[PDB]
Design a protein around this ligand. Structure first.
Ligand code: TFP
Ligand code: TFP
Ligand code: TFP
Ligand code: TFP
Ligand code: CA
Ligand code: CA
Lengths: 81, 82
């Protein structure tokens, strides 16, 4: 069902998200989003998610068990919420 | 019609948006989001909007024609965004 929504994205939408994804993984080891980068982003947007909530957000879309979110999984994250 | 979705939003949702709105207008001369505050947010999220794109984004939800976005219009900007 979520695979569908992503596919329903236009080049414009995907590129917008890619630009956001890129700035988010700055200074990130594997070039992916971990709880650290996700926390920083949500806090700069005025939110204060707990370490548990951040891990759940990530585990929910971490299909390859990397413990991090790559762009493809990031798109599913966008889709969900 | 986006007036419908705003109604659908839950408090927690509206509360999260308020927290965002509040951080976005820190420093705004009038507590509202002008092109300056919107541009900073867009850029903070890796985007690059022209001054015109920013004006248009504001205009789409500027019901009182203030040239700025207050919290109620912001909710519509969020809902609208889809
Ligand atoms: C308790 N629980 C805590 C988290 N909230 C949802 C936060 C969603 N969110 C958000 C919403 C309003 C204002 C700022 C933000 S930061 C943010 C960043 C990424 C995502 C992302 F990745 F999902 F798209 C979702 C959010 C729901 C309730
Ligand atoms: C179908 N379409 C799916 C995606 N959603 C938008 C998701 C973006 N998003 C979000 C989602 C739910 C609730 C709040 C938020 S605020 C927010 C803040 C940052 C980002 C981030 F990461 F990009 F920076 C993404 C989001 C719109 C409808
Ligand atoms: C020309 N036109 C300009 C705007 N873009 C959409 C921007 C949506 N958006 C967004 C989407 C993905 C990644 C980052 C961002 S920054 C951002 C900041 C605020 C809003 C906010 F306030 F509206 F919710 C919406 C966005 C579409 C095409
Ligand atoms: C369920 N969903 C809840 C709220 N809105 C979505 C807001 C998410 N949002 C957005 C919307 C459409 C396309 C891209 C994006 S990225 C984005 C980036 C920042 C913000 C920022 F900074 F403003 F918070 C909000 C959004 C639509 C319906
Ligand atoms: Ca992963
Ligand atoms: Ca206004």
């Amino acid at each position: 069902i979520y695979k569908a929504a992503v596919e329903q994205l236009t080049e414009e939408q995907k590129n917008e998200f890619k630009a956001a994804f890129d700035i988010f993984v700055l200074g990130a080891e594997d070039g992916s989003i971990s709880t650290k980068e996700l926390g920083k982003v949500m806090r700069m947007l005025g939110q204060n998610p707990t370490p548990e909530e951040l891990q759940e957000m990530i585990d929910e879309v971490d299909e390859d068990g990397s413990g991090t979110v790559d762009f493809d999984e990031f798109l599913v994250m966008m889709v969900r919420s």
